[PDB]
Amino acid sequence: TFVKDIKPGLKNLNLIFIVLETGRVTKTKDGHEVRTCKVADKTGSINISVWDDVGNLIQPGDIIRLTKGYASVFKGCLTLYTGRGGDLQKIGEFCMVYSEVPNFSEP
Amino acid sequence: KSLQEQNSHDAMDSYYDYIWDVTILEYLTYLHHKRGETDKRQIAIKAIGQTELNASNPEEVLQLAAQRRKKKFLQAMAKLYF
Amino acid sequence: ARIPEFELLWKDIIHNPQALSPQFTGILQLLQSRTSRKFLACRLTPDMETKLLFMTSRVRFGQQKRYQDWFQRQYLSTPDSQSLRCDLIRYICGVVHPSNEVLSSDILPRWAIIGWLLTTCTSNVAASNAKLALFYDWLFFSPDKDSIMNIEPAILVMHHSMKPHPAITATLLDFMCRIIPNFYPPLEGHVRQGVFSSLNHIVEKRVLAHLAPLFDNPKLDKELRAMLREKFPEFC
Amino acid sequence: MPILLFLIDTSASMNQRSHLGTTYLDTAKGAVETFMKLRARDPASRGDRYMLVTFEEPPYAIKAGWKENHATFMNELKNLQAEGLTTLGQSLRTAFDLLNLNRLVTGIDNYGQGRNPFFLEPAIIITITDGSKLTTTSGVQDELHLPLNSPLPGSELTKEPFRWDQRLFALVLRLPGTMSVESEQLTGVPLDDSAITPMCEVTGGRSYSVCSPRMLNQCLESLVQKVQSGVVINFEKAGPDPSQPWHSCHKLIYVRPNVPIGHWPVPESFWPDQNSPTLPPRTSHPVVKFSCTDCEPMVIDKLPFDKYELEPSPLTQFILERKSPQTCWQVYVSNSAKYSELGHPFGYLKASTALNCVNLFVMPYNYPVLLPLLDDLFKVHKPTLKWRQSFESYLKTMPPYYLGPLKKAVRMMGAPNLIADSMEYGLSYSVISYLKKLSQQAKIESDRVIGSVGKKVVQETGIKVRSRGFQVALLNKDLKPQTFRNAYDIPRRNLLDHLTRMRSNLLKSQVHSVPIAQMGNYQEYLKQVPSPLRELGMMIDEAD
Structure with missing residues (x-):
């Protein structure tokens, strides 16, 4: 189970990721705040789309797994998406070890 | 390699009288000490402690002790198997 | 002790300790006694203790910054948090007793934990309280009933902080050298006895190859090394 | 400050009885006791420290190591049980590793810096055993082989377990069961044929085959005379020899103090160079080769030189009985020169004027050329330019480690700031870091071994x-x-x-049910008891 293998068109996803970082307020379109957050591990790093509702009450460390997802791209940066059948579900908390060195968001 | 066995069908302690080589009895004493059977170790140490089996005896004395033990052991084997 | 009730009780103990309890001979038994882990442990909620156990059992050396900063900003951001730092230091020293097998491994050494705890004391009173908490076990050391875990983080901090953070090492050394006569002159001999026992415990179980370079470190001040030589000719 | 290691055999063969009625292990314990009694006659005996090793498993083989008082040694020696194999090789390796435990941490073996006879820790291993063949769980080995399965760190530097200043004397008990009185017993103690004898011979010692209590007493008397601080050197006749044993035989030289002091180290067997990653392995005994040709025993005033007296051997004394103290035989170690395979003489064997003893004098690496130059400087003189050029040419053909002792020599002589002040050590930084790491590892392993000599546990x-x-x-x-x-x-x-x-x-x-030692110790009992009113043929019979 690696972060690297989040591809478009995948089914029956059971992947595990940890939101160690916090999303930052930013403007998109006019009226909507589609926040974005990035996480990293020993395998790789990937961005996670954060909606306003989740982004207001989010605190770091939560563990969530998606099913029937479909990968998306946002201005050349890969971004996970949920909807039209997809659904999220929290599992646990704090039982992880991270590695922030392999992050691909650097210049 | 044979004394290391433990499924013996012959009276192990009783045959310790018939060993005359001191190294065989040395290995026997080590084996019994390692396995913890103190009493058979005492029998082996008593066997070593016999004056006639002292390895630095005159050669004919050792030869005669070996010969008498050989005779007794072979007679016992004859009584057992005939 | 400012409340007159405690002063009255202390004076009654001084005048006749057997008066309040016939079997209670005096303060000798209390001083020679030991503190059980239950009292140190019980003031912490389970979440903090479990986090510290996870850090000392799973977190490798280097990642300690994120978890401790999270705990500090979330909770340890109050005026009373300074004394709570001392409470956490006491909990780590008295309760947390890791095995030697995990010590041999490359798991996160406790010297980093002690360094983070000490460097966060932003006031002189907080630092004084934390140092008194650290030196509380050092007053009455007993090798037979106590583990070396109460002084291994200390000596590790001194050996590891010589180059990067001389200030912490110098402050701790100055405080532990000056606490000896100041604490209690009628019982300062016990303090020196405990320090000698701890030094002998470090010598017998050689965590470091030689203690000689640290005692007379060139970058330490003159008077500290002078009084270290004066008090303990045995380690010279 | 010598070391006396008793490698007592505890193989079950030591339960053999003799005409004495006691087992061989009992006679071994008595031999150690009588050795102590004879040793105590000498005033110098107060400085020795005894060591005990047995033929048990490694965690229990050592039972009196370092930091063990005499009472603990005696208590361990009394309660010895002969119950193991005749694992002579493994136990001997354990004994040598125990002796060489502290060598690297204190750096007594000056690896890559010549051999110093004054840096010695004199020890002899007295292994008391019977003659029965070697045994292991696999079988009988019938030939002594030292195992090297778990080498101590830095062991490859000497490539031999026994060291320069160590010797192995075997006391092979051959006491017959039934008494056999023989008039041949009046002769000297003979050598034994067992597997231990070659190992004794190579390391400078010898075996003994006792066959009666009086022969045991004679052997123990001989052993007490054979303990003496010194090192063992292998000699060899260089060039056309004058083969009898005197051509090449391991021998001892006495290193007397006044602690030991000396200046010139014996040269290595290799040419040092800073480029090599690792030093070559040096044989434990430095094979020095002597030239039979006569030579002038030169000497100059204020010269730091060392006189070492070889142990007496009969044929060497007999040939040197020919009165010739005025002449001497030079000595050099092979493969010490950068180019030649022979090397230059660093000393000579000049027998004393009285002819009582043959003394080895150790000098600089190539002394017959340096000593005229130094004498010329101290006689005529501000050295000349040609003299300094000659000195530089000499230094080009002189191994680097010698300069340090030569620096001290010129400093004490009266030329404090000669060319030696440039300073050098002449090894690789890799070698020095390796020596530092070996010192750390040696300290760690030594502390572990001293901690583990107790083994306060019993068999499962x-x-x-x-x-x-x-x-x-x-x-x-x-x-x-x-x-x-x-x-x-x-x-x-x-x-x-x-x-x-x-x-x-x-x-x-x-x-x-008090132990026997604490049964009649009236001193402790009286000290515990309150004091009374103040005061107004066989040897021992208790209470003085």
Whole structure:
């Protein structure tokens, strides 16, 4: 189970990721705040789309797994998406070890 | 390699009288000490402690002790198997 | 002790300790006694203790910054948090007793934990309280009933902080050298006895190859090394 | 400050009896006791420290190592049980590793810096054993082989377990069972044919084959005379020899103090160079080759030189009995020169004027060329330019480690700031870091071994019962059954009597089993007891 293998068109996803970082307020379109957050591990790093509702009450460390997802791209940066059948579900908390060195968001 | 066995069908302690080589009895004493059977170790140490089996005896004395033990052991084997 | 009730009780103990309890001979038994882990442990909620156990059992050396900063900003951001730092230091020293097998491994050494705890004391009173908490076990050391875990983080901090953070090492050394006569002159001999026992415990179980370079470190001040030589000719 | 290691055989073959009525192990213990008694006659004996090793497993083989007082040694020596194999090789390796435990940490072996006879830790290993062949669990080995399965760190530098200043004297007990009086016993003690004799011969020692108590006493008298601080050097006749044993034989030189002091180290067997990653392995005994040709024993004033007296050997003294003290035989070590395979003479063997002893004088690496130059400087003189050029040419053909002792020599001589002040050590930084790491590892392993000499544990009481993990324990040795405290320790044989005793003890109304040593020690008992009113043929019979 690696972060690297989040591809478009995948089914029956059971992947595990940890939101160690916090999303930052930013403007998109006019009226909507589609926040974005990035996480990293020993395998790789990937961005996670954060909606306003989740982004207001989010605190770091939560563990969530998606099913029937479909990968998306946002201005050349890969971004996970949920909807039209997809659904999220929290599992646990704090039982992880991270590695922030392999992050691909650097210049 | 044979004394290391433990499924013996012959009276192990009783045959310790018939060993005359001191190294065989040395290995026997080590084996019994390692396995913890103190009493058979005492029998082996008593066997070593016999004056006639002292390895630095005159050669004919050792030869005669070996010969008498050989005779007794072979007679016992004859009584057992005939 | 400012409340007159405690002063009255202390004076009654001084005048006749057997008066309040016939079997209670005096303060000798209390001083020679030991503190059980239950009292140190019980003031912490389970979440903090479990986090510290996870850090000392799973977190490798280097990642300690994120978890401790999270705990500090979330909770340890109050005026009373300074004394709570001392409470956490006491909990780590008295309760947390890791095995030697995990010590041999490359798991996160406790010297980093002690360094983070000490460097966060932003006031002189907080630092004084934390140092008194650290030196509380050092007053009455007993090798037979106590583990070396109460002084291994200390000596590790001194050996590891010589180059990067001389200030912490110098402050701790100055405080532990000056606490000896100041604490209690009628019982300062016990303090020196405990320090000698701890030094002998470090010598017998050689965590470091030689203690000689640290005692007379060139970058330490003159008077500290002078009084270290004066008090303990045995380690010279 | 010598070391006396007794490698007592504890193989079960040591249970053999003799006409004395005691086992061989008993006679070995008595031999150690009598060796101590004879040793104590000398005033110098107060400085020795004894060591004990047995033929047991490695965790229990050493039972009197370093930091062990004499009483502990005696207590361990008394309670020896002969119950193992004749694992002579492994035990001998354990003994040598124990002796060489502290060498690297204190750096007494100046690796890559010549050999210093004054840096010695003199030890002899007295292995008392019977003649029976070697045994292991696999079988009989019938030839002594030292195992190297778990080398101590830095061991490859000497490539031999026994070291420069160590010797092995075997006391092979051959006491016959039935008494056999022989007039041949009046002759000298002979050499033994067992597997230990070659190993004794190579390391400078010799074996002994005792066949009677009087021969045992003679052997122990000989052993006491053979303990002496010194190192062992292998000699060899260089060039056309004058083969009898005097051509090449391991021999001892006495290193007397006044602690030991000396200046010139014996040269290495290799040419040092800073480029090599690792030093070559040096044989434990430095094979020095002597030239039979006569030469002038030169000497100059204020010269730091060392006189070492070789141990007496009969044929060497006999040939040197020819009165020739005015001449001497030079000596050099092979493969010491950068180009030549022979090397230059660093010393000579000049017998004393009285011809009582043959003394080895050690000098700089190539002395017959340097000494005229130094004499010329100290006689004529501000050295000349040609003289300094000659010195530089000499230094080009002189191994680097010699300069340090030469620097001290010129400093004490009266030329403090000669060309030696440039300073050098002449090894690789890799080698020095390796030596530092070896010192650290040696300290760690030494502390571990000193911690582990105790082994306060007994053998497992299990049986490994087979289903042809439930086991039946052995007798609870040293259990100290608390009969009063526990009711299961009361045998049915004497249930009522102990019941009555514990009942009476419980109401308002193990001792007398003190060890034998503490049984009649009236001093401690009187010291414990209050003091009274102040005061107004066989040898021992107690109470002085």
